[PDB]
């Protein structure tokens, strides 16, 4: 026995707060959550405890610390299999990282309708407020490797693989309600733009460099979702704080036969949340894996990921009724003009066992729809339907794709195809053919019906010639970018600018700048002029007469568009650090940790290094992290309790702890003696909007903070910032 | 045309310094730098200017905007074969990535020998000074994917390819000069247990979690390798500031069939140079590809990477004169014992023309050796002799990865291997065996000569049972790790005590943490004490009373071990950041670039925007980034002029810039006044070792500036950093 006698080595499996246990496998943490597909998943999973060590052939090793030579000093013998074995398997460890969305995490879950939508849709998964779909779900970025980092600025995707009774349904959306492009032919062309240059590979996770913005400035037509990227939508605080988008319009077929179009959206039920641009940065450096972190302690602690899905329904009739092509994948549709629906609730509520066997080789794409269902002719949508069944055939080997357990469908599945590499099933009918009288045709065509029928397409009208063409009614760029930028409030407005003006500094060539700025004057002169500013570049007389876009079928701002134009802040799961001292007032600390716990937030308790501290009242504090190793950036507030401040008081690092908080814009909140802190972020005696401060921890201390903490930042904050340096 | 009227698009093909044109592919940048290796590759280059842009089949495309669609709304046609082409090959752009050492940067360069070596080996391209080799060098982490950061705490890689004319010879070596294990049976254990952890996939690039520390404290033979890791060698400034190892004994073999035992060396012509642990982690947010950056912009400037071979040569007769063991590569030789002979000089002078092609295809094994060299024991290389071939068959897709423009050797290659997935070679030879009387036996053996012989092993004595066990030999764990620890100075040993303190405090068992400290008590007790002291551990009386281990045979320190010891600095390639204001005192300036470029020392002109400030003479200034933009992370020391101070004297980010570079330990100048920053930083009026200062830029202030950057940076201000809040 290697495990520590009082068995201190094995996470507690029960929901425990981050920090508190090691992370351990979903199966092990959570054994008692189960859906059908977690259910259908045991039948490969693999144990551990109080097995014999193997080959993969089944026979015991004596000895897994040496390999075979002649003599204890002597060469490796050929004949050691049970060496080769162990170094074959380690050496062909590694597929084919994905193309795009390298970087992701995932969860299963599970999905419910709030009512039968059968009225618009016959697709099974949507007929009953009874019946629950389990789930799999990947959030990632774009840009970078699977070794890349979670807080980047890029976009987020985010694709849920429903496993319905009438087959897997996946919806492969975004965290915005566009793209850069509108032809799936442009693709490889925008892809190579943003991703690392062919020379160098340089940079990763990044698109402040010149081939993005050269890309951008010769193809107006990116200049819609570039606002979403350069505002703070590029950099959320948490894959649980984003918006979800299905990019295109779609269609629902009800039994009638009747189709109506529709834009899918997940709303998240704790609200819309982002970082800033230096937090963002320095924390890829800090914890490069943080969301993918947070991700699995949220759902550790039982703080699950909740999203509400919506569609947006317009009428066939009603396909030229706006100012925009509805197949045009750069374009929006405001919600003050086509209100989002609710459809039904997802739960994300179990970590995988296995990221590589689970997260790794998923598979999601957007042709895998189920009857109710069906397309439209948006161009970049049908460009896609062809990219991702061949992009499987490398990445996970060949056509067999849909054995690897986590691709399963639960639904059954049956048909004539047979072979490729890794075949898993073993079929026994006579045919592998139809029509066939040898196995009375089975399996068998079935038709399309309400339930339970066979897919057919919607019998859409086609009328063309075959022509490689853009649709003239795609060729507009600026009124979008224009709806979103006036939708924005004054300090997303302000982070837009910085955004631009970063990435523009990184382009080397200054050309490249400057167009990319005249593009942005076809937008708003205000947010060109601030960009041009910040670059040194000054706008000519003609830049300056640019007559802005029209607005989007009246409509002059949309506040849907807006993070916190709105506020729609929740507080579970948030978590403070708690910078301690040698000797904490217990009882300011017992009143924080009450009023956090009441409203499910969490804590750490930092200090200048490991181990335990002890309060006045002789408690035991056990210190989570030092200040350098769990820094404000990877916290929502700060709180300082009283008691020894002089112990920290000259703590280079516990100071910076809270100047760096301060930018950020996050609440901070300080106690008694704790008030000293005050001089090292400059704030008055009367006090700021932002810092909460009084004698004690108590009264309406924790309410104060725990008010700001549910508005995220203190945006007043913003003009006090540039002159700490921090 | 979408060029720039002026040209700027196209960055000159001439030496240029950092950041002063856009960088490029080597053929472009240095059209005129050649070697056999560098030119045989032109069959396999391909150019753009003035080609039609085709399909792969050579068919030219009209629209390279479109799909192919029933209508200019119409869905997409599947006869489009010009969009299912480009789309096919976009997803299929990946290949599985190394399974370690997946994040690497790469250079062309040649070696030459310093003098024959004949008497102790027969290897060709040892044997004159007048033989250049062509040679391709990857350097690379280790734990991290192809998209992780640069600048984590890790080993790093030094792999070579010498294309030379008797064959490719690979030295696959490494930054340290030991491994973690002693027998490659354990290697799969080992990296698991380093890697990010199995069920969530975390961290990334760090060893810093659970399983590593776990694995180290039962595995104490890790503990030579972990003291490297955990010392600022795990952090190097640049891959040209780096040591170079081969990691174990090898055989030289003479014309006379003479066996020496060889280790193999690089010695950075640069000097020996590594950031601190604040820096590199910061850095790996501010700039993951700082390494891959600096790597490509020396070579485009000049700078071209230099590392001399060295050999340490022991007799066979004296194979086991020592306490330990020749064929244990946890072991290091001293070189107070054994020498290092200084025997030729590598220089890296191009880049590549496409990172993919050249550096992700490279494939490198230590088992490619050549006539004049051969293996040893070494139960560590016995065992990476099965991998490095057996992994290329998944990784770079068959058995032809040497046809591979990149893996091609210069020399002849012909034998009677046919087929394997993607055979370029056609070859006409009727006979596809030997002996073979149709072809007249050709291609023929060669028997082994003093050149151009076949290969021939070593015919090294071998006697004793097959078995399964460890040298009696190798059991000896704590010796080295403290002739290590010893020879370090009293700041790279409280950098020792930060890295192991930082680490264990991200591991979450605390009983890890325990067994690790017990573990560096066997050590040394000073080591074990301040690494306890940092985790609020106490050592119990036994560990208090455990005696030391041996000095290594007579030694009780080898300055060798130590970056800082003996003086090794070289300026020639290092960065400034001079913080520009809007009236710079031009006489300043003047001083600062003339002497910087009599040294070869770049600079970078920041200021708070971008565009141009204009000087006091009216000399226009362009700025090269803003503060914010290029942190004092990426340079080597910071300048500030005089002129304006006031402009920028409240300025956040000019202030936190000196903070940072302050806090990192390097060289600050402060001009008239620009010493109005001393405040900040803290400085008494009287001055500070490590600040220059004076009233103007006069001759003096710049070789003060000067000789502080030949030091590196400035240790004695260690004790003022700890009250900054930076
Ligand atoms: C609307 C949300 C969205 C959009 C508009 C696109 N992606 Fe995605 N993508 C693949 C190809 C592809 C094409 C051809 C287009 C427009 C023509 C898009 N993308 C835009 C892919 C290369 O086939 C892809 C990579 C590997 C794979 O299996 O599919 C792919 C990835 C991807 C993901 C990741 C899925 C996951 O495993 O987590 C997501 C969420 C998107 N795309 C969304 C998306
Ligand atoms: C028995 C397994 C094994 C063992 C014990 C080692 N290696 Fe290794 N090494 C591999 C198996 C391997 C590999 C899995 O085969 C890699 C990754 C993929 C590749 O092409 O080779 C590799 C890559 C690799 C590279 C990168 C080559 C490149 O840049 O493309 C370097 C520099 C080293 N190794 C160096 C070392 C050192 C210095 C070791 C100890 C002294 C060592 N390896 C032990
Ligand atoms: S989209
Ligand atoms: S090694």
Same mark, same amino acid.
């Not at 981050?18 to 977690?38: F, I, V, Y």
């Not at 200040?627 to 404000?632: D, H, N, R, V």
């Given at each position: 026995?290697?495990?520590?006698?009082?068995?201190?080595?094995?996470?507690?499996?029960?929901?425990?707060?981050?920090?508190?246990?090691?992370?351990?496998?979903?199966?092990?943490?959570?054994?008692?959550?189960?859906?059908?597909?977690?259910?259908?998943?045991?039948?490969?999973?693999?144990?551990?405890?109080?097995?014999?060590?193997?080959?993969?052939?089944?026979?015991?090793?004596?000895?897994?610390?040496?390999?075979?030579?002649?003599?204890?000093?002597?060469?490796?013998?050929?004949?050691?299999?049970?060496?080769?074995?162990?170094?074959?398997?380690?050496?062909?460890?590694?597929?084919?990282?994905?193309?795009?969305?390298?970087?992701?995490?995932?969860?299963?879950?599970?999905?419910?309708?709030?009512?039968?939508?059968?009225?618009?849709?016959?697709?099974?998964?949507?007929?009953?407020?009874?019946?629950?779909?389990?789930?799999?779900?990947?959030?990632?970025?774009?840009?970078?490797?699977?070794?890349?980092?979670?807080?980047?600025?890029?976009?987020?995707?985010?694709?849920?693989?429903?496993?319905?009774?009438? $087959?897997?349904?996946?919806? +492969?959306?975004?965290?915005?309600?566009?793209?850069?492009?509108?032809?799936?032919?442009?693709?490889?062309?925008?892809?190579?733009?943003?991703?690392?240059?062919?020379?160098?590979?340089?940079?990763?996770?990044?698109?402040?460099?010149?081939?993005?913005?050269?890309?951008?400035?010769?193809?107006?037509?990116?200049?819609?979702?570039?606002?979403?990227?350069?505002?703070?939508?590029?950099?959320?605080?948490?894959?649980?704080?984003?918006?979800?988008?299905?990019?295109?319009?779609?269609?629902?077929?009800?039994?009638?036969?009747?189709?109506?179009?529709?834009?899918?959206?997940?709303?998240?039920?704790?609200?819309?949340?982002?970082?800033?641009?230096?937090?963002?940065?320095?924390?890829? $450096?800090?914890?490069?894996?943080?969301?993918?972190?947070?991700?699995?302690?949220?759902?550790?602690?039982?703080?699950?990921?909740?999203?509400?899905?919506?569609?947006?329904?317009?009428?066939?009739?009603?396909?030229?009724?706006?100012?925009?092509?509805?197949?045009?994948?750069?374009?929006?549709?405001?919600?003050?003009?086509?209100?989002?629906?609710?459809?039904?609730?997802?739960?994300?509520?179990?970590?995988?066992?296995?990221?590589?066997?689970?997260?790794?080789?998923?598979?999601?794409?957007?042709?895998?729809?189920?009857?109710?269902?069906?397309?439209?002719?948006?161009?970049?949508?049908?460009?896609?339907?062809?990219?991702?069944?061949?992009?499987?055939?490398?990445?996970?080997?060949?056509? #067999?794709?849909?054995?690897?357990?986590?691709?399963?469908?639960?639904?059954?599945?049956?048909?004539?195809?047979?072979?490729?590499?890794?075949?898993?099933?073993?079929?026994?009918?006579?045919?592998?053919?139809?029509?066939?009288?040898?196995?009375?045709?089975?399996?068998?065509?079935?038709?399309?019906?309400?339930?339970?029928?066979?897919?057919?397409?919607?019998?859409?009208?086609?009328?063309? #010639?075959?022509?490689?063409?853009?649709?003239?009614?795609?060729?507009?760029?600026?009124?979008?970018?224009?709806?979103?930028?006036?939708?924005?409030?004054?300090?997303?407005?302000?982070?837009?600018?910085?955004?631009?003006?970063?990435?523009?500094?990184?382009? +080397?060539?200054?050309? %490249?700048?400057?167009?990319?700025?005249?593009?942005?004057?076809?937008?708003?002169?205000?947010?060109?002029?601030?960009?041009?500013?910040?670059?040194?570049?000054?706008?000519?007389?003609?830049?300056?007469?640019?007559?802005?876009?029209?607005?989007? #079928?009246?409509?002059?701002?949309?506040?849907?568009?807006?993070?916190?134009?709105?506020?729609?802040?929740? +507080?579970?799961?948030?978590?403070?650090?708690?910078?301690?001292?040698?000797?904490?007032?217990?009882?300011?600390?017992?009143?924080?940790?009450?009023?956090?716990?009441?409203?499910?937030?969490?804590?750490?308790?930092?200090?200048?290094?490991?181990?335990?501290?002890?309060?006045?009242?002789?408690?035991?504090?056990?210190?989570?992290?030092?200040?350098?190793?769990?820094?404000?950036?990877?916290?929502?507030?700060?709180?300082?309790?009283?008691?020894?401040?002089?112990?920290?008081?000259?703590?280079?690092?516990?100071?910076?702890?809270?100047?760096?908080?301060?930018?950020?814009?996050?609440?901070?909140?300080?106690?008694?003696?704790?008030?000293?802190?005050?001089?090292?972020?400059?704030?008055?005696?009367?006090?700021?909007?932002? %810092?909460?401060?009084?004698?004690?921890?108590?009264?309406?201390?924790?309410?104060?903070?725990?008010?700001?903490?549910?508005?995220?930042?203190?945006?007043?904050?913003?003009?006090?910032?540039?002159?700490?340096?921090?």
């Amino acid at each position: 026995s290697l495990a520590p006698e009082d068995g201190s080595h094995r996470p507690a499996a029960e929901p425990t707060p981050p920090g508190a246990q090691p992370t351990a496998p979903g199966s092990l943490k959570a054994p008692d959550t189960r859906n059908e597909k977690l259910n259908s998943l045991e039948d490969v999973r693999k144990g551990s405890e109080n097995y014999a060590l193997t080959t993969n052939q089944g026979v015991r090793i004596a000895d897994d610390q040496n390999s075979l030579r002649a003599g204890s000093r002597g060469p490796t013998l050929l004949e050691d299999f049970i060496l080769r074995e162990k170094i074959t398997h380690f050496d062909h460890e590694r597929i084919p990282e994905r193309i795009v969305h390298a970087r992701g995490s995932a969860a299963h879950g599970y999905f419910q309708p709030y009512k039968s939508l059968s009225d618009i849709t016959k697709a099974d998964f949507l007929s009953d407020p009874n019946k629950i779909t389990p789930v799999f779900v990947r959030f990632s970025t774009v840009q970078g490797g699977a070794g890349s980092a979670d807080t980047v600025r890029d976009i987020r995707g985010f694709a849920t693989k429903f496993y319905t009774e009438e $087959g897997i349904f996946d919806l +492969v959306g975004n965290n915005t309600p566009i793209f850069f492009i509108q032809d799936a032919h442009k693709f490889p062309d925008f892809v190579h733009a943003v991703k690392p240059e062919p020379h160098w590979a340089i940079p990763q996770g990044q698109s402040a460099h010149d081939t993005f913005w050269d890309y951008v400035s010769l193809q107006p037509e990116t200049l819609h979702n570039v606002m979403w990227a350069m505002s703070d939508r590029g950099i959320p605080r948490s894959y649980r704080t984003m918006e979800g988008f299905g990019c295109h319009t779609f269609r629902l077929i009800n039994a009638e036969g009747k189709a109506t179009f529709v834009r899918f959206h997940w709303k998240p039920l704790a609200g819309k949340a982002s970082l800033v641009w230096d937090e963002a940065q320095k924390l890829t $450096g800090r914890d490069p894996d943080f969301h993918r972190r947070e991700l699995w302690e949220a759902i550790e602690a039982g703080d699950f990921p909740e999203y509400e899905l919506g569609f947006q329904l317009i009428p066939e009739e009603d396909e030229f009724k706006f100012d925009f092509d509805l197949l045009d994948p750069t374009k929006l549709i405001p919600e003050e003009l086509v209100p989002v629906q609710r459809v039904g609730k997802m739960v994300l509520n179990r970590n995988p066992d296995n990221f590589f066997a689970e997260n790794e080789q998923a598979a999601f794409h957007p042709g895998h729809i189920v009857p109710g269902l069906d397309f439209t002719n948006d161009p970049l949508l049908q460009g896609r339907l062809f990219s991702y069944t061949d992009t499987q055939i490398s990445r996970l080997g060949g056509p #067999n794709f849909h054995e690897i357990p986590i691709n399963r469908p639960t639904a059954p599945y049956h048909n004539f195809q047979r072979d490729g590499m890794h075949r898993m099933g073993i079929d026994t009918n006579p045919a592998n053919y139809e029509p066939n009288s040898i196995n009375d045709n089975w399996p068998r065509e079935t038709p399309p019906g309400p339930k339970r029928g066979g897919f057919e397409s919607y019998q859409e009208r086609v009328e063309g #010639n075959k022509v490689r063409e853009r649709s003239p009614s795609f060729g507009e760029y600026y009124s979008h970018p224009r709806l979103f930028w006036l939708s924005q409030t004054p300090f997303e407005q302000r982070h837009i600018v910085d955004g631009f003006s970063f990435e523009l500094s990184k382009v +080397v060539r200054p050309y %490249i700048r400057e167009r990319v700025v005249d593009q942005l004057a076809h937008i708003d002169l205000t947010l060109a002029q601030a960009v041009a500013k910040n670059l040194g570049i000054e706008l000519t007389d003609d830049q300056l007469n640019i007559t802005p876009p029209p607005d989007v #079928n009246g409509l002059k701002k949309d506040p849907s568009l807006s993070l916190y134009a709105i506020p729609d802040g929740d +507080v579970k799961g948030r978590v403070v650090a708690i910078l301690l001292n040698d000797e904490v007032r217990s009882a300011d600390l017992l009143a924080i940790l009450k009023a956090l716990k009441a409203k499910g937030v969490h804590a750490k308790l930092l200090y200048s290094r490991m181990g335990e501290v002890t309060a006045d009242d002789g408690t035991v504090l056990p210190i989570a992290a030092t200040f350098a190793g769990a820094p404000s950036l990877t916290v929502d507030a700060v709180i300082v309790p009283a008691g020894n401040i002089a112990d920290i008081a000259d703590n280079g690092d516990a100071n910076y702890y809270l100047m760096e908080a301060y930018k950020h814009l996050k609440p901070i909140a300080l106690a008694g003696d704790a008030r000293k802190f005050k001089a090292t972020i400059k704030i008055a005696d009367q006090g700021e909007e932002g %810092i909460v401060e009084a004698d004690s921890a108590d009264g309406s201390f924790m309410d104060e903070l725990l008010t700001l903490m549910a508005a995220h930042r203190v945006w007043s904050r913003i003009p006090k910032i540039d002159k700490i340096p921090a």
